[PDB]
Amino acid sequence: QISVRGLAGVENVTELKKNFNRHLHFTLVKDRNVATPRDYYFALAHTVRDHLVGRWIRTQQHYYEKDPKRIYYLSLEFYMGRTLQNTMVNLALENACDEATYQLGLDMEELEEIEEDAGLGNGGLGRLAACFLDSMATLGLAAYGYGIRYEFGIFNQKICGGWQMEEADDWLRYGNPWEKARPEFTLPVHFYGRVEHTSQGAKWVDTQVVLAMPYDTPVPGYRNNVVNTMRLWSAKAPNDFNLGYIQAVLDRNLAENISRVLYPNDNFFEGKELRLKQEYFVVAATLQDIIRRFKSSNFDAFPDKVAIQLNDTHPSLAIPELMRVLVDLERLDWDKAWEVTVKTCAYTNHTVLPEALERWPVHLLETLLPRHLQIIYEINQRFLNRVAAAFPGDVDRLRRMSLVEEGAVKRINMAHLCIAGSHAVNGVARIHSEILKKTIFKDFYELEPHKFQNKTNGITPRRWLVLCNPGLAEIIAERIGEEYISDLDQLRKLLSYVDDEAFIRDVAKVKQENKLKFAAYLEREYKVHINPNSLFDVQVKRIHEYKRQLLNCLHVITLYNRIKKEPNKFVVPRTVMIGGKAAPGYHMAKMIIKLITAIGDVVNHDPVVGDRLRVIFLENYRVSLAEKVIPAADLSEQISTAGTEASGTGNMKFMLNGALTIGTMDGANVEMAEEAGEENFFIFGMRVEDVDRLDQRGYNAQEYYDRIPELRQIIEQLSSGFFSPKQPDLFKDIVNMLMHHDRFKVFADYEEYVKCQERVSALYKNPREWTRMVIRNIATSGKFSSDRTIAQYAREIWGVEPSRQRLPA
Amino acid sequence: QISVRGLAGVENVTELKKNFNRHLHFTLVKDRNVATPRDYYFALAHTVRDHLVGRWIRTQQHYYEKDPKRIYYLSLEFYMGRTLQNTMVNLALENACDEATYQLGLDMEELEEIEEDAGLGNGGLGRLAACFLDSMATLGLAAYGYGIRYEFGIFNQKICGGWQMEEADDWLRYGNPWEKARPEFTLPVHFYGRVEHTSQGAKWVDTQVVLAMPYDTPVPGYRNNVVNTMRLWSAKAPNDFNLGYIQAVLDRNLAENISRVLYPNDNFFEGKELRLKQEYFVVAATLQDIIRRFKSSNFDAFPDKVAIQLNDTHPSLAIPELMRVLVDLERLDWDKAWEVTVKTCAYTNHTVLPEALERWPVHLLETLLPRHLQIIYEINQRFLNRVAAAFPGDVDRLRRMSLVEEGAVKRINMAHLCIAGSHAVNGVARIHSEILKKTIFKDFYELEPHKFQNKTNGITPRRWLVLCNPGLAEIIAERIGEEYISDLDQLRKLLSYVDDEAFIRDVAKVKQENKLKFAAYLEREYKVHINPNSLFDVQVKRIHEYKRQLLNCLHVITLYNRIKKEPNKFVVPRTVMIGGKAAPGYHMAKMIIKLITAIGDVVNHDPVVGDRLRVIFLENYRVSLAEKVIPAADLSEQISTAGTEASGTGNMKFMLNGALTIGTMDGANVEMAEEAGEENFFIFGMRVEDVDRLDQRGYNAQEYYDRIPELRQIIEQLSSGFFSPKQPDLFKDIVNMLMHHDRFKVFADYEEYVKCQERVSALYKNPREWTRMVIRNIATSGKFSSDRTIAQYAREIWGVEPSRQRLPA
Numbered sequence A, B: 001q002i003s004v005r006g007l008a009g010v011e012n013v014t015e016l017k018k019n020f021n022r023h024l025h026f027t028l029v030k031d032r033n034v035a036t037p038r039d040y041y042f043a044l045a046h047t048v049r050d051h052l053v054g055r056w057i058r059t060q061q062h063y064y065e066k067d068p069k070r071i072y073y074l075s076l077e078f079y080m081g082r083t084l085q086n087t088m089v090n091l092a093l094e095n096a097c098d099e100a101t102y103q104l105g106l107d108m109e110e111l112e113e114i115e116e117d118a119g120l121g122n123g124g125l126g127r128l129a130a131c132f133l134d135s136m137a138t139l140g141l142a143a144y145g146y147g148i149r150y151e152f153g154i155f156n157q158k159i160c161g162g163w164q165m166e167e168a169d170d171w172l173r174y175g176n177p178w179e180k181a182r183p184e185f186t187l188p189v190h191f192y193g194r195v196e197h198t199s200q201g202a203k204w205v206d207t208q209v210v211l212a213m214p215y216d217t218p219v220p221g222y223r224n225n226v227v228n229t230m231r232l233w234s235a236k237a238p239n240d241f242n243l244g245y246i247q248a249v250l251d252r253n254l255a256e257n258i259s260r261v262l263y264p265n266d267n268f269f270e271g272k273e274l275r276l277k278q279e280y281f282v283v284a285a286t287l288q289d290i291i292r293r294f295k296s297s298n299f300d301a302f303p304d305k306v307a308i309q310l311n312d313t314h315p316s317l318a319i320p321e322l323m324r325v326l327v328d329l330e331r332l333d334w335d336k337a338w339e340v341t342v343k344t345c346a347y348t349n350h351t352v353l354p355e356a357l358e359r360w361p362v363h364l365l366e367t368l369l370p371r372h373l374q375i376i377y378e379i380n381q382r383f384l385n386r387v388a389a390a391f392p393g394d395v396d397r398l399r400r401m402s403l404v405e406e407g408a409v410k411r412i413n414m415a416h417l418c419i420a421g422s423h424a425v426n427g428v429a430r431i432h433s434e435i436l437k438k439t440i441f442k443d444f445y446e447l448e449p450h451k452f453q454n455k456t457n458g459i460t461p462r463r464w465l466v467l468c469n470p471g472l473a474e475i476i477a478e479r480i481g482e483e484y485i486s487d488l489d490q491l492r493k494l495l496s497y498v499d500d501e502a503f504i505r506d507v508a509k510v511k512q513e514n515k516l517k518f519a520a521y522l523e524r525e526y527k528v529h530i531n532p533n534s535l536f537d538v539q540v541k542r543i544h545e546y547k548r549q550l551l552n553c554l555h556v557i558t559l560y561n562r563i564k565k566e567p568n569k570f571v572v573p574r575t576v577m578i579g580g581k582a583a584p585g586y587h588m589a590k591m592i593i594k595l596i597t598a599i600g601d602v603v604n605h606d607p608v609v610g611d612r613l614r615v616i617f618l619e620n621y622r623v624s625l626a627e628k629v630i631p632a633a634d635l636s637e638q639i640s641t642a643g644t645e646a647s648g649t650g651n652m653k654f655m656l657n658g659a660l661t662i663g664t665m666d667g668a669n670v671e672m673a674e675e676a677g678e679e680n681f682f683i684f685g686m687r688v689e690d691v692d693r694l695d696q697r698g699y700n701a702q703e704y705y706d707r708i709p710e711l712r713q714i715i716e717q718l719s720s721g722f723f724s725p726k727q728p729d730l731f732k733d734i735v736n737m738l739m740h741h742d743r744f745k746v747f748a749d750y751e752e753y754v755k756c757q758e759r760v761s762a763l764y765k766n767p768r769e770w771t772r773m774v775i776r777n778i779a780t781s782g783k784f785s786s787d788r789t790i791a792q793y794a795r796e797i798w799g800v801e802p803s804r805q806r807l808p809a
């Protein structure tokens, strides 16, 4: 049908059809008369999976022969989404499977909707790991993703009476055709016990053992025949476990609980024992696998053959675990082991919010990991001796830099442990990396300036353009060819088409088609009516106070109040869509969701408004939903308080897909505006410097309430029960927070935000100039490919060269 | 190699080789350079499984078209053992796979040893269900086995310091290639709640829901292209289950515990709530499936299309569950529903031991299954009204026949419920069925004589001759052809070879080969030395007081003491082998195991004994071990106290495989002796009548101790610490039981047992006459095929005709 989806050759289509029929019969044990759409999905998945295996076996054989330096990406989250279409895209199989299924009388897009998301992450950090795996394979790096195979991923969100309800995400119910269990490579992990000192060093004894069983999932590169591995560990009890009889068997559940469920917190730290066990479990099993693979090639060459990347501090225990193994088991002296560790490890920071930083109580580590606590104390003493020598007499610096925090309860600061034991530390956008050196890690930057780097985030143009927006990928390829898909900088060539009347019409046509498709999806799956001629105003991301969904709410109510004031005046019609999950225990975030649905209940049913304004809460936001709504958006809301969102990646997805951005100068928004030109972005609000000035003076929300009549009206509406007639005081917590306890200064940006939104509406009235600005955004989005990001990690941190060359098919 | 293993045609072998290579690559994702023996086992299993699928799909399609009467065999146990060889045998694939694997450079017998037993049963009752499934498929019946998919089957037994230790049987660790998950046919099961009475009948409300997910395993008939289904249910929590957040997800384990583990009791009742949940879970899910299938063809014709066979009282809740569905949900009147139920259900009793009978506390049923208790009360009232009308004024009969037992705690007698609600009740051997009508169910037999039947047990000659003893199957086929394999009565033709010198030599040759193979197995896997020229004296079965492993122990010690008395006298050398598992909480059974190993420790290390006597405890007795030791045995010990072993089936296995039997006139031993002729059996001891006479008089063990000096010596050796030097009083519990509290009258049979054993030893000295008696046993073992047993159930209980005709291939 379309060119970028590859060839549908007669031989290929014939072969796909027969293998589809073979799997339906032999694998699924069904005939065509009993088969359901789900059976058909599985037959296709097995057919496509077969095409991966030869490339998978020979990629791994190739790494064994050539023995390149190996990259290990450690993460507690891999937010993968669906796998079927992605695999077809990377293998150039999409048109062939489309033809083959068509000839069997099936609709492939309908089959694609049957696959469950692999929802093994919360949001941006988990999705970054997924984009990174795709880019590493595409760039020919010998890379392995290592994590946990959660039985339950991020919960499914239902909305009941306007409130969020959580349901278990039982994603494995029907099986997972993409994974291969590898029970033969099962490894022991130790917990509890005590430390014994012998003549020949320390010994960790009397431990409880949990087994780690690996499951391998293939990661295909884009049309290069490379297939890398993501290996996820599952917890298993040993067979003599607890071994009255019946209870001992049932108590096996206690050990296997380690891999049962993903902790559903985005940007927040909960110091629970089970979470600590998860963090050690992934680290201990992964490191044995790394060392095994290294010996099957003297530890001086260890950092020449191994790089370990820590995704946040979640796998920070890799540092003392590597020391434990080298010192206690391999009998290296401390100094040599430390040199190896530092040269092997590198650490990526993803946030500056204090509540997100991991600070583990010493009493937890004492009981659970007694040998690791000893090692951490020794690391701290030697590190602080270095600080003392560099800054003699500076006693407060010593207190500030310690890995051990004093107080009511002693804690270990895991971020300080990561900086001490890594040769590289990076932030995830230029402004964030600068904030790290200037504020929270200033003392560390002064001691070791060479460690600190920036690696601005990116997204994969395979999933986030070709897969989710084939119409746009196609009109682009018609003009500049297909090479941009793995060299996104080539989109710059599109600037010579900004005055091309044919291109302008095509770009605008693709957007309208995307909007019609999404408008139809909403009616089908959720029985809701929207106007596809309206501006699609979209804010999708996890619900948090710092992300300021509440500022969006205030704008929505302002628009409603202005309409009610002058009903017969023309306004640019809008569909305002907001979606995202709240952490189950985050009360304020749950109240914000209720507020959004409550506003919808009033606005969507007001006869005077008509179809000029609609407010929709998008339920169960997740990767597969993002792939639907992002190509349909006109306006992308990126409105965090300046200095709070480290990078953002959702922002980049919208830019690539033909939406304009309204945003603060925060995270990667700054670099996006710089690439496109500030004239082509809708920037508003305080800069970081303005926020600092306000904090120094003291933020008084009452001032704004007093001086802005439109803002006062909204607060009075909220307080009095306008949006909750039966429960007049429902939103009192929200009002109280806004008026007296707002860490994120919602009111301070309100005036400039509303004025900026007026400018957006003005441009949308002129379709031709709107679209020309869109082309200028798409054309300059090249920097934000994760291929660029990974190439920088490879060259500047891991010490390896990327390769775009094919392996033989 | 050998004829009964089928053809190894060039086309077939070529095809098997390529499909083996395909599975190794595509299914296992391995190359020949990394593959282990386990990988090779799985590639073969997948290759053989492929040959089942076409026959499986068309067998089930055939039943849908023809709509025969369907047979549902309900059991909490299916003791299946390994599946690979059995599948090859039934499909005529054994020689072809042997050739194909040979040409790939592999040894198929070595691959076969990698498969785990499916150990989903305890002993005789579970293994009977497995033999029955094989015969039903071989006889072309539309039959389904329904049970529970336990995550952990019967424990693995380790012996440490002579004591039994239990380990979890994690049989699913590496996956099960034989099953097909069917999550699309998942069904809800209800627990707890309360009963509400409305205008339109009772309603069961406020229940907790557990999901039942089916897994289907194919059951191939012998060379007839029929493949039936065994469907096993697995427990799953619903997704809104318990739905702070983390705990609710972890608490899903509570529901899923239902299918976690097999209760390890043989012939003993434990009134635990979890066991009751297991029993209801299998019944509720199975009955919905039955009704579903019946509607997809008015309940008057229900018993014409459905037969339900209850394997013991474990699934007895089928009776009130069927009433519940017909009355509460389908709105049939009571009387009509009861008629349907009675005509549909039939019940098999497997024991007369009082401690094995299921008597559930009313307070348990009240809380767990409140509607079922009400239904049971109503059944009882109507049944007792019938008893009152038939035997007016007989008030004690009313108390004795009630389904409700009075006392400290009220209980429901599940055996009484089964008789009341079934049109047929059978025992499992002629003597057992007679005991049922004369003693424990006498009152019921007087009320409804027509209900009571006998169906003597049998074993499948596929697993228990062709599979485990190909050498014997072959020498038999050389003379009478292959038709006996599914018509075992043809073995009678072998009586014309009892004087054939060629046959005599061949029968004896096969036994010696079997003994050498087993003697070698013992050294390899267990580092133990045995003399293959000795008489192999074998007692393998679960450890229980009624089975009298202790009487065997007494004989062993008698032989040892006689040798020590006259060392230079000739005795026929013996290897005495005893094996079997004890229930984890059965203290006396655990003490008996310790006694056996303790005797071995003394006897096997006495230089004066030499290799004239050896005592071996066979560890981890299970189906796969039975297939090894039974073909190797010379003497089969079947020595239960008369009237205690309902049938036995181990006895039949030994008879078919060329061992002679020493046994009491108990269970099926009586019919075996009758078939072969009493001159060809070694019968000893009290009959049932003698046991009754002794009970009436009062059993005094002291009398025997006083009058038998050899017996006194043994007791004194046990008491004084001869067999436990460091712990002199170790066996005091055993001695105390023998002397004062022996329900099974060990001493009463001791003299006759020892004398009978002398006669065995006498015959073994004359190899030619031993072997001639063996031929007379094998020749008359035909009655004990489960094909005969199933044909009798079909004709006399289920009302269906067996068919030996092939389905098209």
Ligand SMILES: Nc1ccn([C@@H]2O[C@H](CO)[C@@H](O)[C@H](F)[C@H]2O)c(=O)n1
Binding pocket: A122, A123, A124, A125, A126, A128, A266, A267, A268, A350, A351, A356, A428, A457, A645, A646, A647, A648, A649, A667
């Ligand atoms: N526990 C956390 C901490 C930070 N993050 C996010 O990580 C993304 C990837 O770097 C960034 O784009 C975002 F700026 C950041 O908020 C997250 O999703 N979970």
Ligand SMILES: Nc1ccn([C@@H]2O[C@H](CO)[C@@H](O)[C@H](F)[C@H]2O)c(=O)n1
Binding pocket: B122, B123, B124, B125, B126, B128, B266, B267, B268, B350, B351, B356, B428, B457, B645, B646, B647, B648, B649, B667
């Ligand atoms: N809970 C029970 C009760 C009885 N049985 C056995 O069942 C076998 C099959 O009928 C018989 O051959 C045996 F005689 C009997 O002991 C058993 O294994 N478990």
